[PDB]
Structure 1
Amino acid sequence: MNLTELKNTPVSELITLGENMGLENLARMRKQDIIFAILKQHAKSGEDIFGDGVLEILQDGFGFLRSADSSYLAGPDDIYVSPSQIRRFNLRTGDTISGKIRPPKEGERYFALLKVNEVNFDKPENARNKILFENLTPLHANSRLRMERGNGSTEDLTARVLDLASPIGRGQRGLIVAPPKAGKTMLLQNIAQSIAYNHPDCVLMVLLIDERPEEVTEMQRLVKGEVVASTFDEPASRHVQVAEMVIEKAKRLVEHKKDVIILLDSITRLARAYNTVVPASGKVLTGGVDANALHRPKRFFGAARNVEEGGSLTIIATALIDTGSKMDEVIYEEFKGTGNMELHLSRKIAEKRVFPAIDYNRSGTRKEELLTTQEELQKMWILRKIIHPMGEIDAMEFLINKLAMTKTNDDFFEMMKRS
C-alpha cells in the first residue's frame, strides 16, 4: 500500500480502492486524510511496505516527515522521526529517506517509521561520513548550460534569444527583473523544459509562492521535473517554511555532488513573507521593512555557488518591478549586485507584443571569459556592438527576423558574419 501509487493516482482511484475493501464513505475527507485512512485500514491486514519522504526537525527534538507531491504541507500523511534515529543515522533536515514504515499504533495519530533503507537515494551506512556545507568553497560558473533545441518554434526562438543575450552556466547566481505581463510564465517554462530536455542527468525543481491556482496547476502538468508550490491562499508562515525546507533539501542534495537548478518566484514575495512572519527588530527602514527581515532572503539567495569537488547549485530568480508598492524597489535595491548576472525586461517592448521582451543592452554577465570560449565570446561582443547603436525594440525585431529562418544559432553565426 505504498503511498507513491496511492498519491500519484487521482482521488477517484483512491475512493474506488477504498470502497473495494470497505471503508466508510470516502467522498467527505481530504486527500491527506483519505490516504492516511486507506493506508491505515489496508496496513491493518498484516503486511508492511517501504516509505519515502523528506524529514524536518521542529523546535522539539522530535521530527516529522513530509511528501513532495503534498506541496510540503503538514498533515496525517506525516511520518514520525524519533530523535533516536537522528543519533543512530546522523539524520538532518532535507534528506530524502526511504525505508520500512510502521502503521500508527494506539495513542499516536500520524504514521511511524521503522527502519531506514535509502538515505539520499543511497545506502545509509556509507552516508554516515559526509562533508557538510560550512567547509565548502565556491567556484565560478564554468560548465555552460544548454537551453537550445534547434527545432525552430517560438519557444525555441525565445530559448535562442535568452541563450545569446547572456550565458547561463552551472552553479551561477542570476536574477530576472521583469514587471508584470512581461511573459515571466512562458519564459520560466522555456528554461524549465529546455534544461529538462537538455540535461536529464541533473534533477529539476521549481518552487512557487503566492501564484494563482490555475498557474500552479498548469505547472504540474507541463514540467517533467517535480514542482513544489504554495499559493497565496495559505498564510505567509506556510510560504516561508516551504521555502526554507526546499532550499535546505536542495543544499543537502547538492552536497552529494549532484547538480541542482532552481527557478525562484519571487524574491520580493519571499522578502515580504519573511517580513510579515519575522518579529520586528525595532529598526524599520522605508517601506515598512526592518533590517532582519531581508537577512534571511539574503542567505537564501546567496546559497548559489559551484562546488569544487563536485556538483553545482544554480539559482535563477525573478523580481517584481515597478508594481506601485514602495517595498518592491526596496528589495530591488537591496538585492542588486549580489548575483552573478541579471536579465532585464521592459513594458514598451511587450506593448507591441514583441516576445520575448528581454532587454539585451541592460542584460549582462560577470566573468564571461571563464564560462565560455574566447571565440564564441567574441562572436557575442560583435552582436553587442551591433545592438548598441539602434534602439532595444528595433534590435528585437531585427534579431527575431534574422534568427527565425536559421535553424540554430551556430549556423546563424556564419550566416551573419558574411554580412
Structure 2
Amino acid sequence: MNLTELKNTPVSELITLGENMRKQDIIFAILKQHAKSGEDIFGDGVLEILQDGFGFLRSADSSYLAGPDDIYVSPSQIRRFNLRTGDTISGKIRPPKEGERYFALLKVNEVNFDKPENARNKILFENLTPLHANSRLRMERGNGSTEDLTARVLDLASPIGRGQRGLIVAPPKAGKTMLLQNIAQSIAYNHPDCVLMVLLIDERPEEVTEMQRLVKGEVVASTFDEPASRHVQVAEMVIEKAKRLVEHKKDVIILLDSITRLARAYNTVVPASGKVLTGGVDANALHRPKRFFGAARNVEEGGSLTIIATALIDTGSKMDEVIYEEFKGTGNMELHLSRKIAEKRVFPAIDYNRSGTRKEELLTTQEELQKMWILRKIIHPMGEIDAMEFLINKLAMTKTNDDFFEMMK
C-alpha cells in the first residue's frame, strides 16, 4: 500500500479497488480506509528542506515541485539521519490529522536506496577527492546503425569518461538536442549501470515528451513555458539528488539541455551587483551556474558525476559567447556542431578541429590515442564540411571504429 503506486495506477483500477474496501480524492479515501484497518501505509519522494528546518518529500509527477501529496518530514527526523535536500526517502506514512494538510512520515525505511544508519556515516560530496576522468564511457553501439555514426565520431573527436564536464556547443538548429538523445541511447545500452538523468531547461515542450518516451532513465523538465525561478529551483533539486547518489558511490550522468538557458535563468534571478559584463550578464551571475556545471567530477572514493550539457553560440547576443567561454574554462570536453555543415544536411554536423577532450590519454588505450592523433592531423587541413563528409564516408565502410583503425593500416 504505497502512495505513489496508487498515483500511478489508472483511475479505473483505483475505483474498483476502493469499492472492494476526483482521482486525488479516491486515493485519499482509500489510504484513510486502509489506515482505519490498522494496516501500514507507505510513501516516498525526494527531500526538500525548507528554511524553517522541516522538509517535504516532493514527487516526480510534480517535477519535484510543491505537490498536494507531499510528505512532511519533521526536523528531528532530518537531524537523526543527517538528511539533506535531494535525499530520496521511502517510509511509512499517516494521513493528516485534524488541523493538518499533509501526510506525515512515521519511520524512514530507506534513504537513497540504502539503510538509514549508513546515511549518518558517509563522506560528504564537498569532501570527496576530485580527479580527472579515468573510466571511459564508450558511446559506440557497434550495431552498424546509421544513428551510431554520431556516437562513433564522438568517440574519436571528444571521448567521454565518468565524471566528465562536457558541452555540446553549437548555434540553434545545428543538432545539439538530437546529439544529446543519441548519447542518452548509447548510455542506456552500453552503460545500464549508470544512473541516467535528463534535465531539460527552457527548451521545447515536444522534446520533453520525445525524451521521456525515448531514453531509459529519469527525465526532469521545465520548458520555456515556465519562468526562470522554476528553472533554477528544479535544477537545484536535480543537482543535489545527483550529489547524494554520488555520496553512495554511484555513477550519475546528467544530460542538460540547455545549460546556456539555465545560466540565463540564474542571471534573471541574481541580485543586481551594480556591475554588468559584456552582453548583459551580471558580474556575479555566473558563480551559481559555474558551481552547477562544476559539480560534475570524478571521485577517487567511488562513483562519479558526469554532466553533458548543450550550449549556444553565434546567436548574435554576446551574452551567450560569455556564458559559453566561461563554461569552457570550467569543463573539460566540448563537442562543437557547425551550422555550415548542418545547412548542407550533413549529419552529424561536427566541427572536428574545435571539438576535443582534456587529458584524453586517461580515457583511451595507447594505440587508440595514437590512431586518433593521426586522424586529427589528417582532418585538420580540411574544411569543416569536407572533414565530416570524408570521415563519415570512411566510417560508413565498417561497423566499428576498431575495424576502421585496422583499415587505416
1:218-276 Cα shifts (integer Å, max 9, x gaps):
21111111111111222221111110111011011101111111111122211111122
Distance 1:133 1:282 in 2: 33
- For 2:18, the equivalent position in structure 1 comes to 18
Deviation at 1:14, TM superposition (A): 5.5
- For 1:372, the equivalent position in structure 2 comes to 364
Distance 2:216 2:104 in 1: 30
C-alpha spacing 1:348/1:290, structure 2 compared with 1 (3 Å): same
1:140-168 Cα shifts (integer Å, max 9, x gaps):
11101121111112211111111111111
Deviation at 1:330, TM superposition (A): 2.5
C-alpha spacing 1:344/1:134, structure 2 compared with 1 (3 Å): same
Contact preservation (8 Å) 2:46, 2:64: no
Deviation at 1:323, TM superposition (A): 2.1
Contact preservation (8 Å) 1:44, 1:103: no
Distance 2:27 2:154 in 1: 43
Deviation at 1:113, TM superposition (A): 0.8
1:263-312 Cα shifts (integer Å, max 9, x gaps):
11122211111122222122222333212221100111111111012111
Deviation at 1:4, TM superposition (A): 3.2
Contact preservation (8 Å) 2:129, 2:301: no
C-alpha spacing 1:37/1:333, structure 2 compared with 1 (3 Å): farther
Deviation at 1:216, TM superposition (A): 0.4
Deviation at 1:35, TM superposition (A): 5.2
Greater Cα shift, 322-331 or 306-315: 322-331
C-alpha spacing 1:179/1:105, structure 2 compared with 1 (3 Å): same
Contact preservation (8 Å) 1:7, 1:69: no
Deviation at 1:19, TM superposition (A): 7.6
| Structure 1 vs Structure 2 CA RMSD | 2.1
Greater Cα shift, 87-96 or 320-329: 320-329
C-alpha spacing 1:296/1:14, structure 2 compared with 1 (3 Å): farther
Distance 1:70 1:15 in 2: 23
Deviation at 1:372, TM superposition (A): 1.6
Deviation at 1:40, TM superposition (A): 5.0
Distance 2:23 2:333 in 1: 41
Which of 82, 89, 107 aligns to 1:90? It is 82
Deviation at 1:5, TM superposition (A): 2.6
- For the pair 1:55 / 2:65, whether they are aligned, the reply is no
Q: Scaled by the length of structure 2, what TM-score is found?
A: 0.94
C-alpha spacing 1:387/1:257, structure 2 compared with 1 (3 Å): same
Which of 221, 224, 235 aligns to 2:213? It is 221
Distance 1:36 1:327 in 2: 49
- For 2:306, the equivalent position in structure 1 comes to 314
Which secondary structure state, in structure 2, belongs to the residue aligned with residue 233 of structure 1?
coil
Deviation at 1:68, TM superposition (A): 2.3
C-alpha spacing 1:120/1:232, structure 2 compared with 1 (3 Å): same
C-alpha spacing 1:20/1:155, structure 2 compared with 1 (3 Å): farther
Contact preservation (8 Å) 1:143, 1:169: yes
Deviation at 1:393, TM superposition (A): 1.0
Deviation at 1:172, TM superposition (A): 1.6
Alignment gaps of 5+ in structure 1: 22-29
C-alpha spacing 1:286/1:217, structure 2 compared with 1 (3 Å): same
Deviation at 1:83, TM superposition (A): 0.2
C-alpha spacing 1:44/1:401, structure 2 compared with 1 (3 Å): farther
C-alpha spacing 1:36/1:391, structure 2 compared with 1 (3 Å): farther
Q: Report 1:168-179 matches (<5 A).
A: 168-179=160-171
Contact preservation (8 Å) 1:51, 1:99: yes
- For the pair 1:352 / 2:344, whether they are aligned, the reply is yes
Contact preservation (8 Å) 2:176, 2:337: no
Contact preservation (8 Å) 2:239, 2:292: yes
C-alpha spacing 1:115/1:159, structure 2 compared with 1 (3 Å): same
Distance 2:227 2:28 in 1: 24
Contact preservation (8 Å) 1:40, 1:104: no
Greater Cα shift, 41-50 or 150-159: 41-50
Structure with the larger strand share = 2
C-alpha spacing 1:323/1:39, structure 2 compared with 1 (3 Å): farther
C-alpha spacing 1:19/1:296, structure 2 compared with 1 (3 Å): farther
Alignment gaps of 5+ in structure 2: none
Distance 1:260 1:292 in 2: 28
Deviation at 1:196, TM superposition (A): 1.0
